Amino acid sequence: KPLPAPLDGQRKKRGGRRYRKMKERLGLTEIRKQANRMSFGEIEEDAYQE
């Protein structure tokens, strides 16, 4: 199958209603804090544990 022609329509016109369940499936309300944070100053766990 040929690759569909790329396009950029309006991302979203309305919100609420079902839109919320949509994100709930993928993009639900995670911790959203201390997971994508780095803590500029100090070090968590070991230095180069990775």
Partner: protein
């Protein structure tokens, strides 16, 4: 012991840095500052370990601080080698033998006094010897007693996993952590010129933050909430992966956009 290996490691390190440098710019950056490479990730650098002899020039160890009274200048060496923080195998083995004999006598005397060997007791020999005695204090201790044949399993894991395993010879859970680089990171920060000395190479002073104690980055945030889950095109994925490189370059602009790093091509920005 192996001199050819040391030459190989210094060559590979020079290659890795080169790769990063070329990514930063096509032109060869004569006298590129090493501070960007060896600075720990939490402080904005790449957090790269060193095995070669790297001399940090004194010219890169000066930093300024402004108070209402005026501006005051300050000064602070060689980059530490990781091997210095790695206990030799022979010392590891003799240490392990003596520490486990000590643990045997401590355990028998605790049993004599109806006591359980404490992790604090193990703390005395905190992970002493080649193996980490600390494991004696892990929760899965009872569960891991049935995980027989784990070294051979880890060695054979290469036939089942598409990711190459460098620590194929050991398991973190069973053998413990045989190495520690916390003091390595501390000495890296000190040798690079201290926290403020390193930050002088960055745009931290440009943010006008009164102190660096309570700050934090936002890894994978971007302008679109990082847009991680999507049906995005491969080119868009490459752009998203290159965005953190944009953040890194912006962070280290004050020390790489200088005329010492690049000779010639002094072009003013538009307007």
């Amino acid at each position: 012991n192996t001199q050819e290996l040391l030459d190989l490691l210094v060559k590979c390190e020079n290659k890795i840095q080169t790769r990063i440098k070329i990514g930063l710019n096509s032109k060869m950056p004569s006298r590129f500052p090493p501070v960007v490479f060896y600075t720990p990730k939490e402080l904005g650098g790449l957090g790269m370990l060193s095995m070669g002899h790297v001399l940090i020039p004194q010219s890169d160890l000066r930093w300024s601080k402004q108070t209402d009274v005026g501006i005051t200048h300050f000064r602070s060496q060689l980059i530490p080698n990781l091997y210095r923080y790695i206990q030799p195998w022979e010392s590891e083995f003799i240490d392990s033998q003596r520490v486990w004999a000590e643990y045997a006598l401590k355990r028998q005397e605790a049993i004599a006094q109806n006591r359980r060997l404490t992790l604090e007791d193990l703390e005395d020999s905190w992970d002493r010897g080649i193996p980490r005695i600390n494991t004696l204090f892990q929760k899965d201790r009872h569960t891991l007693a049935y995980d027989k044949g784990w070294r051979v399993r880890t060695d054979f894991k290469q036939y089942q996993v598409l990711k190459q395993n460098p620590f194929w010879w050991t398991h973190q859970r069973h053998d413990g952590k045989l190495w520690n680089l916390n003091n390595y990171r501390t000495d890296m920060i000190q040798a690079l010129g201290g926290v403020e000395g390193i930050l002088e190479h960055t745009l931290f002073k440009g943010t006008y933050f009164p102190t660096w104690e309570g700050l934090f980055w936002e890894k994978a945030s971007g302008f679109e909430e990082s847009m991680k889950w999507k049906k995005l095109t491969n080119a868009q994925r490459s752009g998203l992966n290159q965005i953190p490189n944009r953040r890194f370059t912006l962070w280290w602009s004050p020390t790489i956009n200088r005329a010492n790093v690049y000779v010639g091509f002094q072009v003013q920005l538009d307007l």
